[PDB]
Design a protein around this ligand. Structure first.
Ligand SMILES: CC(=O)N[C@@H](Cc1ccc(S(N)(=O)=O)cc1)C(=O)N[C@H](C)C(=O)NO
Ligand SMILES: [Zn+2]
Length: 255
């Protein structure tokens, strides 16, 4: 198979005699196929930054050991080189402490895997508006990706109501340094949706939330150039193309 870096892919495997799915040491979790009792699914994601050229996954069965090859594609992502440099980029120490703490909290959540589905049907778009900056937009320094856009921004005037893309459990609901007012929702199976730069948060950590339900109001908080809704998905432990993923997810999970 082939996959573009920064994308997720749904793997399908036989349910019976299946013991484990591995990439090197890493176990990859599995969940039931919703429409076929003899199948299981797994999600495999490539990082945007520093992917490997190729991936060899092994699915161990009682009497059998099948292999799976996935080649990394580049995609046609938007790319802006920086040759000028002059780089330093370090802030005060209690600000770095904030950045460090919020980062380790977020990884604790993103590492984690709820082994049941908290979602309900297909994902929705968090609001009915257009994209003003797509996932994958990169900044280059020396043929290396310095940074990239880890979600997709929708046009939204400050105060634009924002709805939950799917059901789940709210895991974050506070102002953070880079993301500003942010809500992160656990949908199960290590799938997290993200809603950043909000002007107002309408949910509490731990709170169960249904697809469609209001989560807050759009805003301009955090590292942004103006008011917009930043929408991201994390799955397979990686930030992935939000709209692509929604599209792949709904193909399996409608009804
Ligand atoms: C630490 C970092 O990498 N920040 C990046 C991406 C970013 C945001 C949030 C997070 S999390 N889930 O708290 O670890 C990681 C990475 C970033 O500046 N995103 C800005 C807010 C954006 O998207 N503007 O439209
Ligand atoms: Zn964004």
């Amino acid at each position: 198979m082939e996959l573009i870096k920064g994308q997720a892919l749904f793997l399908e495997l036989d349910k019976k005699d299946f013991l484990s799915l591995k990439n090197n040491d890493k176990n990859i979790p599995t969940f039931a196929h919703p429409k076929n009792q003899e199948k299981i699914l797994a999600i495999f994601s490539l990082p945007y930054k520093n992917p490997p050229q190729n991936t060899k996954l092994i699915a161990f069965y009682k009497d059998k050991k099948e292999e799976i090859f996935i080649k990394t594609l580049e995609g046609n992502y938007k790319s802006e080189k920086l040759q000028v440099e002059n780089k330093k980029i370090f802030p005060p120490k209690t600000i770095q402490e904030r950045i460090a703490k919020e980062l380790k909290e977020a990884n604790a959540i993103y590492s984690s895997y709820t082994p049941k589905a908290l979602f309900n049907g297909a994902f929705n778009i968090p609001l009915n508006s257009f994209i003003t900056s797509d996932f994958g937009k990169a900044r280059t320094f020396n043929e290396k990706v310095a940074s990239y856009h880890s979600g997709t921004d929708f046009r939204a005037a400050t105060g634009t109501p924002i709805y939950a893309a799917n059901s789940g459990v709210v895991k974050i609901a506070k102002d953070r340094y880079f993301a500003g007012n942010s809500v992160v929702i656990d949908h199960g199976f290590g799938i997290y949706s993200q809603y950043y730069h909000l002007s107002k948060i309408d949910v509490k950590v731990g709170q169960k939330i249904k697809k469609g339900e209001l989560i807050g109001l759009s805003g301009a908080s955090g590292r942004v150039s103006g008011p917009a809704l930043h929408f991201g998905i994390l799955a397979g432990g990686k930030q992935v193309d939000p709209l692509d993923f929604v599209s792949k997810f709904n193909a399996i999970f409608q009804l």
